Amino acid sequence: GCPDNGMSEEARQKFLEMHNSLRSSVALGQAKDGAGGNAPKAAKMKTMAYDCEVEKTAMNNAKQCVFKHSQPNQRKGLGENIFMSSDSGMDKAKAAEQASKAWFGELAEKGVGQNLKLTGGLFSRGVGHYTQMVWQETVKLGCYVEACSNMCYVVCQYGPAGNMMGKDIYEKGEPCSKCENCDKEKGLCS
Annotated binding-site members for Zn(2+): 69, 129
CB atoms within 10 A of CB 86: 8
User: What residue numbers does the annotated binding site cover?
Assistant: 69, 129
Q: How far apart are CA 141 and CA 156, in angstroms?
A: 7
User: What residue numbers does the annotated binding site for Cu(2+) cover?
Assistant: 69, 129
